[PDB]
Amino acid sequence: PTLEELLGQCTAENRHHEYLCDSQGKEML
Amino acid sequence: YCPARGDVILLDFNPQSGHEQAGKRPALVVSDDLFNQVTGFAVVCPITNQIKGYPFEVPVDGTTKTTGVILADQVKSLDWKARAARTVDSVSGETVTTVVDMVSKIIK
Amino acid sequence: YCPARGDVILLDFNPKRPALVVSDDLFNQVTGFAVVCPITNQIKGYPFEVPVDGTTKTTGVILADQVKSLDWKARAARTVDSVSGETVTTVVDMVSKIIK
Numbered sequence A: 001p002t003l004e005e006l007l008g009q010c011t012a013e014n015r016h017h018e019y020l021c022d023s024q025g026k027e028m029l
Numbered sequence B: 001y002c003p004a005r006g007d008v009i010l011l012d013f014n015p016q017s018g019h020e021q022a023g024k025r026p027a028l029v030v031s032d033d034l035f036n037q038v039t040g041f042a043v044v045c046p047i048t049n050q051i052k053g054y055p056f057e058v059p060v061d062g063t064t065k066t067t068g069v070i071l072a073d074q075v076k077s078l079d080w081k082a083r084a085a086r087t088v089d090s091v092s093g094e095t096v097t098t099v100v101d102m103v104s105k106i107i108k
Numbered sequence C: 001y002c003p004a005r006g007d008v009i010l011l012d013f014n015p016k017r018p019a020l021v022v023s024d025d026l027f028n029q030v031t032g033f034a035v036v037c038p039i040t041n042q043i044k045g046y047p048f049e050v051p052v053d054g055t056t057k058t059t060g061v062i063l064a065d066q067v068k069s070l071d072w073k074a075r076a077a078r079t080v081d082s083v084s085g086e087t088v089t090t091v092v093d094m095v096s097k098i099i100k
Helices: A003-008 B033-039 B093-106 C025-031 C085-099
Strands: B007-013 B023-029 B041-048 B057-059 B069-071 B076-079 B086-090 C007-011 C017-021 C033-040 C049-051 C061-063 C068-071 C078-082
Touching (some): A003 B093, C007 C033, C017 C085, C049 C085
Antiparallel strands (some): B007 B086, B023 B041, B041 B069, B041 B076, C007 C017, C007 C078, C033 C061
């Protein structure tokens, strides 16, 4: 489906914490 | 060894801080094999067994031992050398296609 | 505040840094994630480098091979600049080639 349609179903109960938020080796960010 | 597109890999998650415990994390490789070998990077989407019905969750399919969902909006290019990537599994072609479709929708 | 597509933002780093936002505006607002590529002053001539264009203070190349989805708020994202549309298109063009 459309990005709008996808985004429309995001909720407070739905969302995930960011996995692998660390920076290793060559990673710039 | 180099990660292949469609592989499920385990990556070192090694924060120097924070509440989240260090360890290996599963992720899906969506980047081209040649990209992965030449850059020493791999574009990956995290895999989780927490299934909330979140819109960008893509169900893992076509695997041997791997379950859960792929988080497509968490797409990241990661250093698979520094993080000691190991291929433990792989998914179906349409699994990758679905994830990549979501990403391209996000960045277009 | 929310990051916009085309924005050059500064992000906190780890073991402040410029990056280009390639993710859609509504995506950045709703999910709290931004999909960004880092900008660097080192031009190494890698095939995945995209020259920055159409900007005020910002120079260098955008690294499409280092693209990352991140939490922009947690990194104290701030927009200092932006780039031409053709620039974002080129970066996004390289990213999709990488993952397809």
